[PDB]
């Protein structure tokens, strides 16, 4: 238990280390989707329209 915490903890080192490139992928992809949906809802607003009050 005393000495096993090192090598047992290394599995948590790998499990937490593997999340770096993952959160890189999410933060680099979800903003591309943010500008995709942003331009998609932006292009809905068209110039030809009716004027009310």
């Amino acid at each position: 238990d005393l000495y096993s915490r090192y090598k047992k903890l290394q599995q948590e080192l790998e499990f937490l280390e593997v999340q770096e490139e993952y959160i890189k992928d999410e933060q680099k992809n979800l903003k591309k989707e943010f500008l995709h949906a942003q331009e998609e809802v932006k292009r809905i607003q068209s110039i030809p329209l009716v004027i009310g009050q």
């Binding site: 238990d1 005393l2 000495y3 096993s4 090192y6 090598k7 047992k8 290394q10 599995q11």
Partner: protein, 187 residues
């Protein structure tokens, strides 16, 4: 004793080492006080260490091994601490010895991992004195095994007969094999 003494540089840069031996012996006393003062004589220490002229390669390799890790990386100090040949040194609680055996074990099992995946072919040469000084303090830990580090360090070294002698004198054999496989299944 001395702090800014520069005469030891001229004595180290001089021939007839019968005066260099006691000058280095007194240098080992003030080396912990001032390690940076030897940086000017490091080159000459390497010069007198590479050649076989000087009779005591451990007097040079110990000074270099205790000034390199104080100056730069632990690799260059480790090459001369492991390259010091026969070294008579008892177990001590000093920072130097515990750091050179700490990096010695860390790089030892590092080479054991670099050579564990290649059983045959292009096998890297491993010096026997590394096995001597690792298995010496290792057996010192294996006096009673402390029932915690036997299978742990025995598994980290990736060696074949390192753990067969551990289970010889051991209490609660089913607990040692159950704890052993428990540690093996979690790595």
């Amino acid at each position: 004793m001395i702090t800014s003494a520069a005469g030891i540089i001229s004595l180290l840069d001089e021939d007839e080492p019968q005066l260099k031996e006691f000058a280095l012996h007194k240098l080992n006393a003030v080396v912990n006080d001032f390690w940076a003062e030897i940086s000017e004589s490091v080159d000459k220490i390497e010069v007198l260490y590479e050649d076989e002229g000087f009779r005591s390669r451990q007097f040079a390799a110990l000074v270099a091994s205790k000034v390199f890790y104080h100056l730069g990386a632990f690799e260059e100090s480790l090459n001369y601490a492991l390259g010091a040949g026969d070294l008579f040194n008892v177990n001590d609680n000093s920072e130097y010895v515990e750091t050179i055996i700490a990096k010695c074990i860390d790089h030892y099992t590092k080479q054991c991992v670099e050579n564990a995946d290649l059983p045959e072919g292009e096998k890297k040469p491993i010096d026997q004195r590394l096995e001597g000084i690792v298995n010496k303090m290792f057996q010192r830990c294996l006096d009673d095994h402390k029932y915690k580090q036997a299978i742990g360090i025995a598994l980290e070294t990736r060696r074949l007969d390192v753990f067969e002698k551990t289970i010889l004198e051991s209490n609660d054999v089913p607990g040692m094999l159950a704890y052993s496989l428990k540690l093996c299944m979690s790595l």
